[model samples]
Target chain A: MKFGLFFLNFMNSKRSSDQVIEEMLDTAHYVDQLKFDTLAVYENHFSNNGVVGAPLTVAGFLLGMTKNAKVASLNHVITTHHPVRVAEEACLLDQMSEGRFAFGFSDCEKSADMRFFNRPTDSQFQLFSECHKIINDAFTTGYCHPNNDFYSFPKISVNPHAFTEGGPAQFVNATSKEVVEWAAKLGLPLVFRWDDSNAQRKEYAGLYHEVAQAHGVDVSQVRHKLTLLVNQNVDGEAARAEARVYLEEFVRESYSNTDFEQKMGELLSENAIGTYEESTQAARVAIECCGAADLLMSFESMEDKAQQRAVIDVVNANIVKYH
Target chain B: MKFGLFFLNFMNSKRSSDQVIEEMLDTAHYVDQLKFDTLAVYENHFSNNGVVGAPLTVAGFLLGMTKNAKVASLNHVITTHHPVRVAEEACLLDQMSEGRFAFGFSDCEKSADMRFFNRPTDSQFQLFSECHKIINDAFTTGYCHPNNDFYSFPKISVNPHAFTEGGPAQFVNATSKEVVEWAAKLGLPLVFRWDDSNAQRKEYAGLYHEVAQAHGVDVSQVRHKLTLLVNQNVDGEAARAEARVYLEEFVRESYSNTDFEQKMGELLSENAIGTYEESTQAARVAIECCGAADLLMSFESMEDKAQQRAVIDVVNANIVKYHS
Candidate 1:
């Protein structure tokens, strides 16, 4: 069992960008001192829910902050990239960080980003397939050359081989049923992007394992990502109540505007884990059934120094036993 | 002339990542309130330097805090990404921001990144060509089937056309002669990756204009990116003294152990510009010669804030009287 805090700079009307940087740094330093297992850097370009368009660059800047913890960038939508540069850029970060990197990919279907970069939205599957081929080729075989429907290359390679043989661990953030199947078939680690409630989502993990087995892949090797918004523990019920006020406002304000809230609301509603406690408990149960061996407990909410650590301690106390 | 400040998360050993984020937010708020044209986000990855890896993501979060500022990830290194996803993700951001987005590109050669993703050390040109083609096709034609020596695509298209005509203003962070040539060929907008003193660097604006003319590009329509590190009045004494310290430290710290430092030192030494002040001044002059007019004033350094602003205000104080 490992713990990591997800820090999405959800700016309300009060905070400024400079203030946001200070808070983020403070949290990062705290994580380093506390010796968190890893800091997951999620990417959401213009959506505003998460803060990380270029994960590798941010991870690089944070290399000096910690020695023990690693950094992971999720859903690096490879289907939108040229494999050669992706490989090269990622490797550059690997070297700067001294080999502490986790590259996560996802197959997304969004049209705006395509138009922004002068790319097409259709043929996402083929783009990803080609992406996998090019990146893997860049890894095993210096560079990759693919002539696909959406993108092509006569001959190319991503270079300066990484210290970790076969490059860093590749985890695919599987949001859809198809993505889960792809992760299983590709023999890559799977990251469940479900909400806190796990009871219903467990079925998908079971399906993933079943598919992996069918493909002669070991499902046990896959890991799952989890987030917990904690507000209190020490100083009893009163402190907990006070913290809830902040959490409620934070969640409420964010949900009202973000597309994430809409999609997640539907899933959580279906799972029947509406309350915070029940939802969290159900999420744990879901992981067990999903066969998640490595669980990343994300400490969400609260910027108070003592509170952040307290939340992690609470999560670890209750969750470590399950893993 | 328009002004924009670079709100960087200076995450050195002195500050935590959270603290840096706070600093950037404060800066963003100031720029938004001050009515700056655009706030550019420089996408830098995996270094202890003040470089931020995920500029746009940070920018997205900052948008909520800003009043009227448009967020621009001016150097996202689009080449490192897949075409469709790039189109989809950036487009989502643009829509979320209600057409307030400026996508940027950069091609930094680093072994750490090269090895991490398993890409080649050489052949950046090949990769660059293919990436641009895919991006262009995705936007204009809605779908494209590009075949190149490095990457190939059967068909691709991103829907829901962009707010900016032909998408947001295109920016390329370039430095060498070859890069200038490419920017001219694309004829979008060009951004210089050098410090304020780089105008003295060999053939700065001259090479850019030359290439533009050779390519038959309408040079007047193109925007050239420059940086204003100082903003003092014409007395130039106090500002120059402050700029010397501020700009030098910025360079020293950024290029510390990176290969870019060594190459830059070698390049500049070969083309000396008298004293340090003269050199910096010469460099600034050279940038004007090279073909950059749209300058971005960076005030992240508290020590150089006023001077950085002064550089822009004073430099372009009398554009009508001087140039006209």
Candidate 2:
């Protein structure tokens, strides 16, 4: 199973913003040296908690620092962007990194704030759908022209077309199980949150085949990633307790605009905490039986830096090599 | 004197498009290993010749590869972007590179293409002026609020503000001397083209002092870069003739939307062609006599790889190191 680390720079006001970014840089160097499979940056913009203001740009830097792992962006919002710009931006990353870039997209609902970017809040979904097609044409056909009311432009080439044929491992951040069929129909893999209900998660695990096959897509073409938090150590129960305390503060912090009750329920239900050998067993079950291609785990739940490093060390020693 | 190499990935159908990008990667590696001061990517978009369409993203890649040397973007068009986006985007680069980021901006006029990026061509400069102020506020102060027709927004902070105190080396692509005063008033340094005539180019050199002093700006606050081409070898005249032929093909290529006579005249009058020692002496004159802080030279004119390597090697050996 492929293993990846997803970084979300949470602010508790205890550490400086510079410290948050530096630790990720520190974690990237740590992961890359240990030969991790992937490192990802979250696109959290325009908020008190939005430390990673530009994910694509950070992905470029991450892709540059490491030689072994692939670099990916999580949930790039489409409403504020031009597909033409996004395609060319991805194409540059694809070429520069020598085919080691994956792009994940997220869509927005009709909201008051999108006006800052001039996105038509009334017609945002249609804009997202159109951009998806225009992006695909450039990724697959090497050049594209848009016909939608939002973007009508002459045919333009993404010069030095994407290094990976059919684009660099396209993904959609499937926020709900309802998004899976649409993502599958587009032949894009899904990235599901562990915050999903068990029944919803199982449906996400099982529903891809039904929808993908009906859409004439092979089940083999889909690889859904389940994002989970892991806090593992030899002091297993202490690890579990520490994660609970950290999660509580994470929800209570005013750094985000999230529903406390909803987040508290979801985070508590899905995350794992225990010994290194124990958690990988949890991760292995997540991949094999849960139908997830892999897990994107967060180790930042532990407040102690040494505990984070120690877990990875033992996990590296204990987990069976996927290769 | 500071020395940098500005790269514009010129598309020539004779070579595959991928080869063009690879050569820049190759040149960046070469320049970085040899300790060049700066390596910049040019922003040329929506044209056949635009290979480096997203210069800031490319700058991120260049900054990652080299431990030394700052990475900069040239002529990032202001008419097409939101200042908030640009400020945050640059903040990330500055923090990531550990203060090794420089931003250069260009503005556009009313045109058919202004609709593509939703830029109001009728009032674009006003937007540019507004953005310039908003960007400065974010660079100097931690947060900014724009009070303008284009982007009146709630105040926002560029978290982990610029790695450098006043932002990473601000610049404007002053296409003409007419822009010198406006940019100087904002205390931004200028990047001028050798593409200008002697009068226009010299005015760029001379007028910055005039405008900056009048505005109570320290003359030392500005360090203008003069972009030029350089080709040198043992067979000095051959190097000269080769640059001419290369310039001929570069202009004749159906790749750009530039005036032929204009490009030809500007390119011929200014570029350096000689042996390494000879070119260093010539470069010294440009810096000492003229007001350029240093040069951003193009070594891609010589078609041969060996010639390219040779010029940089001897120049690296010959040029004086500028340490603060």
Candidate 3:
């Protein structure tokens, strides 16, 4: 099993920009020392929720600062930027990191950002599919000159090709059946949010391998990624007490006009929160349930670095310590 | 005058990818230790002449490693990227660098790239202008909703706004008279190639300041940038002998369908190549002639790291040492 850290809520009205950056870099260093596999940063535009608008740039920064842990963009929104530039930046980061990089792409969920890029709802999937093809062509053939219905570009080869074999591992969100099928057909990994239950995860995994095998891609190469919102403490009550406000705010601010229970569906509300032992078991159960080798713990609030650090230390000591 | 290094050629068929990156980072460390003002990387697509397809990523890496010298994209092709993303990336770098980042843009010179982006020849300048407006809006007001004929986008603001007051300094190419005027009108700095002579440079500067002053922008705030292709040697005869092949090859590879002298125009071809003293004098003369406070040196034939390091040391000891 691989463990990674995720940064989501980077915005706080009280913290200075310098303070925010220091906290991020400090956490990265902390994770690096803990022997984490990756440090994943979120991509958000026109929002105070994250400072990773240019995720490749942020990834480059983290990769430069750390030695062992790879740095990845949780998901670069495909509709927001040009495919050529995106492909080139990914290639550049992959080279700079000496293969310690991954590029996760997504069809952005925010309609506001989609409109900001002048992309309508219907054209997003088409654009994303075309962009993914262009990027793949850029990496494998050293040039991309796709002329599809949605995207057309002249023959332009990538400079200084990817350091990783066949480019950095590509990942996509697998919330819906269509996206899961698409990702599986492409032989890419699927990233699932915490909302997915064990049975649902198994179903998705089954669909992934089924479609992937039909496409002649090795089924074993197709992987599933699971992310859990975590807050850890020695005492279960203390953990739940500390997590309530943070988790509530995260859900409330991250998803608007939706009830928390409705969004979470049948999944247990407290599955990812509680004492270190309990949360570790939750994580273990999640990985086992999903048959996912990649586990990412998305910390709720990192405004207070000390508190965040304490949680990370306790989690690392309990979960990573034995596992 | 501020001195900086430029990386335009980052390919050699003989060198591996790891070797190429080591050369780049090693050179960056050397330049950083020498206290240069900026380390500028180029943005070239489908081309072996440069490796920095995403200059901001390279900039972030270098900025994270270095303590003082600012890192910049020599010129991000404005026609090839989304303006909002460009603006946001610049702001992120600016904040990360604590206000030590510069965003330099250009209407891409390569027609292939223009075609790749599906931008027509006539529409490029228009798109570039609109893109510049969107970027400015993103940095200042945090929202850009430009509905120009060439481009349209919904209102969206930048996150974690610029650290630098009024954002990082914006720059654009001044290769032509119209672009110089446009940059001056926008109160942005203008960067010129080494093709112009002293008189032509003076005329261009005159136009820049006049237009800038008319627009209520301070004339002094309108800075001029000059880039010169340089080849140097400790010995004068050996310098000329060694520089000829490198300079000729550079001209041949970078330009086409014109005589070297004709392409070079009346500007002294030797202004960027000679002995240590002569090259140093050449740089000084070019700076004075253009009246440029920012000088970028485009080194020739740095295929070997030792040769490159030697040339850098010589240039610094003979040129920047005296200037500072």
Highest TM-score model number: 2
TM-score of chain B of each: 0.76, 0.87, 0.88
Given candidate 3, what's the lDDT at residue B2? Answer: 77
lDDT of 3 by residue, B7-114 (tens): 665464665555666667778888877846677877766655676788888888777777778888887887767787788788878877788888877876778777
Query: Each model's C-alpha lDDT?
Result: 0.55, 0.72, 0.72
Residues B120-235, candidate 1, lDDT per residue (tens digit)?
55876667667776666655554557666555544543532354456655677765567667777767577765452444433546676778788898888777776544324344
List the DockQ of the predictions in order.
0.04, 0.60, 0.61
Worst 10 residues of 2 chain B by lDDT: B315-324
TM-score of chain B of 1: 0.76
Q: What lDDT tens digits, residue by residue, belong to model 2 across residues B181-250?
A: 7877766778776444445667676777788888898878568886667778787767667766666655
Models sorted by TM-score, best on top: 2, 3, 1
Tell me the spans in candidate 3 whose CA falls farther than 4 Å from its real position. A15-19, A121-123, A195-200, A214-217, A221-223, A234-244, A247-257, A261-271, A300-302, A318-320, B10-19, B195-200, B235-254, B264-271, B321-324
Across A115-216, the per-residue lDDT of candidate 1 in tens digits comes to: 443356566676777777777776665556677655454664343445466777778776667777877787887666534245435666767778989999
In order of appearance, the predictions have TM-scores of 0.52, 0.91, 0.90
Q: What C-alpha lDDT does candidate 2 achieve relative to the native structure? A: 0.72
* Model 2 misplaced regions, further than 4 Å: A48-50, A109-113, A233-262, A274-290, A321-323, B109-113, B234-259, B274-290, B321-324
Residue pairs clashing, model 3? B142-B157
